[PDB]
Amino acid sequence: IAKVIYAMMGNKFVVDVDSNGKYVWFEFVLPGQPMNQGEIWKWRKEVNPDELHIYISENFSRVMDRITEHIKYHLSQPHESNILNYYKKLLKAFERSKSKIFNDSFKKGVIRQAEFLFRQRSFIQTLDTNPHLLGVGNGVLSIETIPAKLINHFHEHPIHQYTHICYVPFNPENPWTKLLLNALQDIIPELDARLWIMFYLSTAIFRGLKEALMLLWLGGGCNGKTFLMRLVAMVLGDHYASKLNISLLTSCRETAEKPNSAFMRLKGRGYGYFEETNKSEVLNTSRLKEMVNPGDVTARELNQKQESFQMTATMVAASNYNFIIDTTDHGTWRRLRHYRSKVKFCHNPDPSNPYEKKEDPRFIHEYIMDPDCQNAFFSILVYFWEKLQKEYNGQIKKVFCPTIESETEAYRKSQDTLHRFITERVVEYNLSEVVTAYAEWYNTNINVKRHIALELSQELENSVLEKYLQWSP
Amino acid sequence: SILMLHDPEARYLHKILNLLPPEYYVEYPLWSNVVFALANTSANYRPLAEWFSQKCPEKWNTGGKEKLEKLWNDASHHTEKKITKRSIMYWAHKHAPQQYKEIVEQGYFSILAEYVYSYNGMLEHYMIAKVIYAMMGNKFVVDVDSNGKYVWFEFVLPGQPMNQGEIWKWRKEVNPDELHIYISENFSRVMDRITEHIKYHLSQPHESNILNYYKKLLKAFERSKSKIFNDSFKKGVIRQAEFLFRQRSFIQTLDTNPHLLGVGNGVLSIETIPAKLINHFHEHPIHQYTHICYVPFNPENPWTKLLLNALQDIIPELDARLWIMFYLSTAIFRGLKEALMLLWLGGGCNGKTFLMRLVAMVLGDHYASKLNISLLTSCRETAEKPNSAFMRLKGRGYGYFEETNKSEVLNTSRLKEMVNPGDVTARELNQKQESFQMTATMVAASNYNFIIDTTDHGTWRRLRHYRSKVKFCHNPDPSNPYEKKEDPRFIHEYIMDPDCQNAFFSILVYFWEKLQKEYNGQIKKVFCPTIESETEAYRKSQDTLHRFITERVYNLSEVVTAYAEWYNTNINVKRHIALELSQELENSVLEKYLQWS
Amino acid sequence: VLSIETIPAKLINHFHEHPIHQYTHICYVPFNPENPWTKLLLNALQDIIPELDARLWIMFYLSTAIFRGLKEALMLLWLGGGCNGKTFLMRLVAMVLGDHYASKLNISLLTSCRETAEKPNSAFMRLKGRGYGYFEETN
DNA sequence: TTTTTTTTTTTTTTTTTTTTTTTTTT
DNA sequence: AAAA
Ligand SMILES: Nc1ncnc2c1ncn2[C@@H]1O[C@H](COP(=O)(O)OP(=O)(O)NP(=O)(O)O)[C@@H](O)[C@H]1O
Ligand SMILES: Nc1ncnc2c1ncn2[C@@H]1O[C@H](COP(=O)(O)OP(=O)(O)NP(=O)(O)O)[C@@H](O)[C@H]1O
Ligand SMILES: Nc1ncnc2c1ncn2[C@@H]1O[C@H](COP(=O)(O)OP(=O)(O)NP(=O)(O)O)[C@@H](O)[C@H]1O
Ligand SMILES: [Mg+2]
Numbered sequence A: 001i002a003k004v005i006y007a008m009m010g011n012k013f014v015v016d017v018d019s020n021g022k023y024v025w026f027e028f029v030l031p032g033q034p035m036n037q038g039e040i041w042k043w044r045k046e047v048n049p050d051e052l053h054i055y056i057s058e059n060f061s062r063v064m065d066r067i068t069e070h071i072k073y074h075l076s077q078p079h080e081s082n083i084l085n086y087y088k089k090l091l092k093a094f095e096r097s098k099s100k101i102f103n104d105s106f107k108k109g110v111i112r113q114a115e116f117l118f119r120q121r122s123f124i125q126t127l128d129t130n131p132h133l134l135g136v137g138n139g140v141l142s143i144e145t146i147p148a149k150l151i152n153h154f155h156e157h158p159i160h161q162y163t164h165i166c167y168v169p170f171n172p173e174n175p176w177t178k179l180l181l182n183a184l185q186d187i188i189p190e191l192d193a194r195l196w197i198m199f200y201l202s203t204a205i206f207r208g209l210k211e212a213l214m215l216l217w218l219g220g221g222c223n224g225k226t227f228l229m230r231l232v233a234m235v236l237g238d239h240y241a242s243k244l245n246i247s248l249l250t251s252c253r254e255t256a257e258k259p260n261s262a263f264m265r266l267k268g269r270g271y272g273y274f275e276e277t278n279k280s281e282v283l284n285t286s287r288l289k290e291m292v293n294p295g296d297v298t299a300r301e302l303n304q305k306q307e308s309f310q311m312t313a314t315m316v317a318a319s320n321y322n323f324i325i326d327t328t329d330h331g332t333w334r335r336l337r338h339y340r341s342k343v344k345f346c347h348n349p350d351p352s353n354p355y356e357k358k359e360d361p362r363f364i365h366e367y368i369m370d371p372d373c374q375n376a377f378f379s380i381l382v383y384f385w386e387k388l389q390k391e392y393n394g395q396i397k398k399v400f401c402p403t404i405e406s407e408t409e410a411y412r413k414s415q416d417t418l419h420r421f422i423t424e425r426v427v428e429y430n431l432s433e434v435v436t437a438y439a440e441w442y443n444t445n446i447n448v449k450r451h452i453a454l455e456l457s458q459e460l461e462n463s464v465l466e467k468y469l470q471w472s473p
Numbered sequence B: 001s002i003l004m005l006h007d008p009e010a011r012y013l014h015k016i017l018n019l020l021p022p023e024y025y026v027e028y029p030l031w032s033n034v035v036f037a038l039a040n041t042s043a044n045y046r047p048l049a050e051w052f053s054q055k056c057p058e059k060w061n062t063g064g065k066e067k068l069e070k071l072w073n074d075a076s077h078h079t080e081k082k083i084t085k086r087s088i089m090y091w092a093h094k095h096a097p098q099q100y101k102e103i104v105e106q107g108y109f110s111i112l113a114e115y116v117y118s119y120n121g122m123l124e125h126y127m128i129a130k131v132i133y134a135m136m137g138n139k140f141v142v143d144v145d146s147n148g149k150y151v152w153f154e155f156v157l158p159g160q161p162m163n164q165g166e167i168w169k170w171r172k173e174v175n176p177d178e179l180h181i182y183i184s185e186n187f188s189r190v191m192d193r194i195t196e197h198i199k200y201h202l203s204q205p206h207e208s209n210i211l212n213y214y215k216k217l218l219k220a221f222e223r224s225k226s227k228i229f230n231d232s233f234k235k236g237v238i239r240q241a242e243f244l245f246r247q248r249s250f251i252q253t254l255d256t257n258p259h260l261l262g263v264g265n266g267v268l269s270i271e272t273i274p275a276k277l278i279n280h281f282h283e284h285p286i287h288q289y290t291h292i293c294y295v296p297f298n299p300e301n302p303w304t305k306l307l308l309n310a311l312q313d314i315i316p317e318l319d320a321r322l323w324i325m326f327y328l329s330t331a332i333f334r335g336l337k338e339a340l341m342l343l344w345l346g347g348g349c350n351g352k353t354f355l356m357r358l359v360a361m362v363l364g365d366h367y368a369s370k371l372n373i374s375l376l377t378s379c380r381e382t383a384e385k386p387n388s389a390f391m392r393l394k395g396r397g398y399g400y401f402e403e404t405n406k407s408e409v410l411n412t413s414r415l416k417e418m419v420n421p422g423d424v425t426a427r428e429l430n431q432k433q434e435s436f437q438m439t440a441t442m443v444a445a446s447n448y449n450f451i452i453d454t455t456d457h458g459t460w461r462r463l464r465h466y467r468s469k470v471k472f473c474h475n476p477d478p479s480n481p482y483e484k485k486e487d488p489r490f491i492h493e494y495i496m497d498p499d500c501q502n503a504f505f506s507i508l509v510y511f512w513e514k515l516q517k518e519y520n521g522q523i524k525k526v527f528c529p530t531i532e533s534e535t536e537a538y539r540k541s542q543d544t545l546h547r548f549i550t551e552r553v554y555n556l557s558e559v560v561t562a563y564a565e566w567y568n569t570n571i572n573v574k575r576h577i578a579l580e581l582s583q584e585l586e587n588s589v590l591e592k593y594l595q596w597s
Numbered sequence C: 001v002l003s004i005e006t007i008p009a010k011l012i013n014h015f016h017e018h019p020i021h022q023y024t025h026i027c028y029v030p031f032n033p034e035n036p037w038t039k040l041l042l043n044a045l046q047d048i049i050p051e052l053d054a055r056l057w058i059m060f061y062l063s064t065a066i067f068r069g070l071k072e073a074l075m076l077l078w079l080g081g082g083c084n085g086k087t088f089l090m091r092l093v094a095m096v097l098g099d100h101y102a103s104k105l106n107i108s109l110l111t112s113c114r115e116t117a118e119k120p121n122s123a124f125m126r127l128k129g130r131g132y133g134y135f136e137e138t139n
Numbered sequence D: 001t002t003t004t005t006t007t008t009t010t011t012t013t014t015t016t017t018t019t020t021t022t023t024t025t026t
Numbered sequence E: 001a002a003a004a
């Protein structure tokens, strides 16, 4: 009967072995059956195939009764004597065996036996591999072509991980879409900066390898940073987006034999964001290099073995203060595009000051939990992704947003210690006394730690201390 | 009208349905509800819902002629509101008390009859499960927890052995003991009915060689009857019935909407003014609760008068008491709130502990709890360790800090995340890391002033400072209106008394309703000049830069260095740093004489 | 089971219905001054603390230990030279109350300042349900 | 300093079931 | 008395 039930429901169930070595059950969800919200047309994990138990205890009885009536018809026909005794014994044995189908231990044994028949090798590792398929609230969405195609019928793609947001085509006539666009315009005054920020945010849906980049942008109170960041992170969903701990970025090495359990928060996550900060946390200029590089990183989670996965996420950090970078190598400064907010909200806006507006607390307290606004925002995101795809090729380091590069260059000029001393207390012989003066000045001001690189006789001297400067001993 | 013939269970639904009074077909608001229920139960048999709509209930002349289009668009009903057939059964039980049981005993006897007839006397671990689910399908529910093991929830009814204040609420059971008793107590009479039916059919002489059949059948059923009381058989039946009772999407919907409170005599709803107590069935899923009964706020109660006078004796101001009560009243709400936090200090024995402890105990353990001050006074711990005493904030509504020390600096990094309408992530002991929606009203108690080293608008947007005025002494002196005599009965008793807790809960819900009707809902709308005047005075202090400028004062490089002597010799010593003063003083009053060169 | 609901305190040496599980191994008898042990203890108590008013409060303070409900915000500390009997009296109280109701607490809880939020500690967990505690500091 | 212990690591499974089962029909 |  395990063989028969596999022949009956072979196209709806599949079994594979997980990492720990325990068989698990997956079933295809179809319309017209009880289910969790927004998990239609997708594979669903099943600890015990209770649907299979119900099927074997309900529908199999029809086939069993059909066999009973077939035996009855064969017995009723005129026949010999020995044949009739054989058929009577057959019917007796068959009914005694039929009585067993409703037993519990027998059903468990049948499930155990059918675990082998339903098994399909290379299924767990093939789940959610291609980053062009997204599980949405009403099916699965494909961004393989332009425009994106929504699949709401039967398919065979192994999709298990989804979000609870339905998808509709981008329509600017929707009241929610117009309200959201107006609020977005009010948040970011400059056109080029707004376009660049939307282009950067729109890549969060794509879960493949991306260009090594990161956005830092700060401001005062009531700037809308948390509103937009939380809106993105929540419209993507828990599975695809998550919040990250600032200590995971600002701290030092974690000991090699200690499991992290927080680094895995981005394992397969397409988007992550940092919320808070103190006065001045020195940026680690490491433990971020791998999380930004389109490469592979390794770590160990709770009570598991050492494992490695590929870095695929979009990162953005919000702050009320500037970070401390204390490095000048081209590797770190290739990334870290920097922005500064200009709009400011206070309950009593000052006239004749365009950089000042009134709050609408209904943006935070409500308008976020409402599904329709989230659907409109998802439409905005997918439209922006397809726009970035149709032009500019696919690379994001091609859009002309001179404000962002100018601000990044200005931030680079600050926080850089190479010219600060040469401008304030240039002395004018291997600059040993000069480097000691550098260190004593920066201490308790720019760099509280004594300089240990002897790098002032290197690309540092090639920066501003050249020409007249001499280094012969 | 032929789809009802596809299955008798829909015919039993119709038998329940015709018991419904015809008055339902009129006054539409409580007519569309049954349509909602029948639609959300399953869309396959929706034509039965249309059949009921056109069934000619009451009269066709009430505007329902040739069916109404309010039904056609109701076929979508793509919302989240949930009403099930349990409400229909409860309504059918409301009318005709002597008809529901006698009409469901058909079905009860039926299903068992077909099962015992098709498979002779043999009974296994699914037929019993199906019949049991047919009997009590409303009192129990099963869903999978996070760890992947099935759990059992039982609805609680009046007149039942139960814990205090668990009425009309779901309870968590490791094993359905009530069901283990029901399967062996009330099923027995059903089996006895089956046996007496068999005996009655045996008594009537039908024909030869078939009364023999009603001897093998009787012997088999007699053998199978005793299997109910067997322990292993009951365990198998429970295991198999776990699937029938399963209800998908139930764990994540438990205690979600912040407008429902579980109280000692039901569930409290604050969706509509005035708040309505629920004491009849209902369908909303509530598991957590408080052991405090709820009564409407009546000032004539002696305890209410005493408590109001005690409140009057603690906060001399009138605007200040209103603001404090309004802020505290948000503790009942468990949704997104304004990013605000109140911290207030004063002399010893001022009753702040009394008020905070009273609020915490009135709300209960599930909704409110105390929090350690180390979350404020210490730096953030590294990401590898699993943090407890922080996820204690998960799902709560109110938390208070009472411990205090000498002059200490607030870590204004937890403050920006632990007072915020956003999302926070953490991880508890022996568990993975997850993020939980954050809702909590917080207040801080101390007798020594905190230290705030920042000046940005991000932190000062929140925070509100107050100073206690009255003072209790063992031997109060004459005059001194800010001095009064203690009543140790306020702490050592008057707070374990349930009636006082009920009165305080009534006061709190009344203040919530008052804040709801006027001032809209926002707390940054009530005008209490004293609180922000005191907050601004506090912000005038703790701002070392402006005080230094006023008290004592070429090149901008001479700044910071000149401030260092004041920073060390005065206003603490500490260690001197820069790269923040060069920006703050730049964006400050020191500009006219500032030497940019 | 000893009940102090109403004066005089009653001893329930027969069947009852209260849910009592924890206990001490000390039998209870009415206070009789004529018992030789009682006389010896009273004489030693009078020897240890001479002043009558000071002695009275001390005994009352000790009496409060039996109770396990909310008490007053009072803490007693008394100093002196060596060989004064403070350890004798405090240990006697701790032993007569028993382990379930009395315990000795480390002074490190008062000498140190505080452990951070994520430090699982003994953290006066001995105070969970215990009605008495003593330190005996020596530095 | 402080350093690492704690957290983890196991440790929580077995007791039914099964078996048999005498009887009961053959 | 042997098989279920
Ligand atoms: N476009 C907008 N128009 C009006 N009000 C807005 C707009 N965007 C946001 N708000 C409101 O402004 C307030 C500030 O929200 P929030 O994002 O928390 O401030 P923030 O500065 O980004 N976070 P923080 O920097 O930590 O203070 C909220 O009440 C929002 O509802
Ligand atoms: N309205 C009141 N009238 C009279 N006595 C009161 C009143 N409110 C409180 N008390 C008493 O005053 C004392 C102060 O108790 P408490 O709540 O601990 O104040 P407190 O300031 O929080 N304690 P502390 O942390 O040391 O300042 C208690 O004995 C209360 O019973
Ligand atoms: N009432 C008493 N009459 C006579 N001798 C007594 C009495 N009480 C105690 N002693 C004796 O005096 C000794 C000193 O008591 P003890 O408790 O050791 O002092 P202590 O201060 O608590 N311990 P230490 O701090 O090391 O001196 C006891 O060991 C007894 O032998
Ligand atoms: Mg924000």
Ligand SMILES: [Mg+2]
Pocket: B349, B350, B351, B352, B353, B354
């Ligand atoms: Mg107090």
Ligand SMILES: [Mg+2]
Pocket: C083, C086, C087
């Ligand atoms: Mg001693």
